[PDB]
Design a protein around this ligand. Structure first.
Ligand SMILES: *[C@@H](O)[C@H](C[C@@H]1CCNC1=O)NC(=O)[C@H](CC(C)C)NC(=O)OCC(C)(C)Sc1cccc(Cl)c1
Ligand SMILES: [Cl-]
Lengths: 302, 300
């Protein structure tokens, strides 16, 4: 309670969604300036999906085999190339709705909004976290590939995710906008599985900071720890080790509360070793790990 | 395979503007040549405790209202009040005005909120109208005039405009006719809501969602009558389940092959026993802000 998963407003991304069709296979693409980005498996027949030779499938393709549409309006394709697992289709029209944007590759633990799309039309938007096993717990059906995940910083859309697949456990995997998968997955219809997931320590710490900011601070103790000692203990509880970047992005919440990051780690260490003893934090007996330090700032101070 | 999903907010973002009167700034909704916003923008500090709004509005001029759409000021050429909403007529029509209507939602229904500050969209999330006519939102200073909405076909149904926070941290507001949901009043006083209840038909929709996604540890072989379930529900401050609700659940029942009253039997067992360590769709608590329509749209 107090916090909810808040997505970024989706309008700037909605203005960039199109559909891309090869034969009868339609998925979503992202139209920025005069380039459309989409998953390369749009060019696959199901026979060639068991294990595709993408370079060879693409040699047989011409610009005029790709049907790109913004709604019902066709955008003529004038060039094509493959970059890793994404297709780049040059089109003859620069998207007038192109926002200021960048392509970023996010780290596990970071959150982003997903604009779920089908045949080029948005259905919904929600907030996802990249798990340490490089999956997301999304909500995706057939025809959703090419949907993108993004953050907005002032004027600028940072695109971080394009959707490609669903795994047996029901979680989802995909690439950055340079076509590089997050995690060890491949865009082939061969059996693959997500590694064992772990808890996102940096986000749990952000949540404890958030609890302190709201006056819920019984779990603070008078001790500290080294980063190494904490990481070795955390791993025993299936918690991710902290990086230096994690310590850095906790900086603003550390300053707001006056609680050093390593002192908060010592408090978390005691919670892990001793449990809640029947208590709650921000209403919950469970520790939340899908709010980043930035998400906390957004909702408390923003 | 299940998330709290909001409608895409682009059609509403194209309507948000900033409205300023004196030292007060909040958001307005610009449709055609009219901007809608909470009337308490005209309020001063020395009047917020018992504001005679009709009296305060007659003392204002069109030029006291600064409306800005981005870096562009819109000229106000007229103004009226409809209940707790101020209507500012401006000289230019919003070309981004979508197909739309104003609706009043019922408790238990859900909608998306576009939280805005200074006329700029900041975040989007899904909310439910609580049975006590509050909403559990995330709203800060300056968020007033933010709107809640649903989308059907290409039509945006506006149902909520944000006015206030209660001491318990929940929120209250009006429909776009300016009528509050609940017994709340747009004066600067601490106000409390009636006792809340849990939206039972929605908890059931969410249990069906957890089945669809393979969670079924909570199912059982028992069955219950509708009335006997409702007796237990009311004891735990759950809303009673109507036969219209049973019908509304049919698709989810058919899709899973679990009779509605069988799912009621599972919910009764959870209410009486608890979850006992276990979680459903990741939660330790029963979720009641997904409607049947919500769950279906997302599992279809
Ligand atoms: C978009 O094309 C689509 C999106 C999924 C369809 C249903 N929900 C989705 O998120 N993507 C695909 O269908 C994938 C296309 C391939 C990767 C080129 N196919 C896919 O997701 O298959 C999953 C694997 C890789 C075969 S692992 C697996 C094995 C057995 C059972 C399951 Cl559920 C997954
Ligand atoms: Cl939430």
């Amino acid at each position: 309670s107090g916090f909810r998963k808040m997505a970024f407003p989706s309008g700037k991304v909605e203005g960039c969604m199109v559909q891309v069709t090869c034969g009868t296979t339609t998925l979503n693409g992202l139209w920025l300036d005069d380039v459309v980005y989409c998953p390369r498996h749009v060019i696959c027949t199901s026979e060639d999906m068991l294990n595709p030779n993408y370079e060879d499938l693409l040699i047989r393709k011409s610009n005029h085999n790709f049907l790109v549409q913004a709604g019902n309006v066709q955008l003529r394709v004038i060039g094509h190339s493959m970059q890793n697992c994404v297709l780049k289709l040059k089109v003859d029209t620069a998207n007038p709705k192109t926002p200021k944007y960048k392509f970023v590759r996010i780290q596990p633990g970071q959150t982003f909004s997903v604009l779920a799309c089908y045949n080029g039309s948005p259905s919904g938007v929600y907030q996802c976290a990249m798990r340490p096993n490089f999956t997301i717990k999304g909500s995706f059906l057939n025809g959703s590939c090419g949907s993108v995940g993004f953050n907005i910083d002032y004027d600028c859309v940072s695109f971080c995710y394009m959707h490609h697949m669903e795994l047996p456990t029901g979680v989802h995997a995909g690439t950055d906008l340079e076509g590089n998968f997050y995690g060890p997955f491949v865009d082939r219809q061969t059996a693959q599985a997500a590694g064992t997931d772990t808890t996102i320590t940096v986000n749990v710490l952000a949540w404890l900071y958030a609890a302190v900011i709201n006056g819920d601070r019984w779990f603070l103790n008078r001790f500290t720890t080294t980063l190494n000692d904490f990481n070795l203990v955390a791993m025993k509880y299936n918690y991710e080790p902290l990086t230096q970047d994690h310590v850095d992005i906790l900086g603003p919440l550390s300053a707001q509360t006056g609680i050093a990051v390593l002192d908060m780690c010592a408090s978390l260490k005691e919670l892990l070793q001793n449990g809640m003893n029947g208590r709650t934090i921000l209403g919950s007996a469970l520790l939340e790990d899908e709010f980043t330090p930035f998400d906390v700032v957004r909702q408390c101070s923003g």
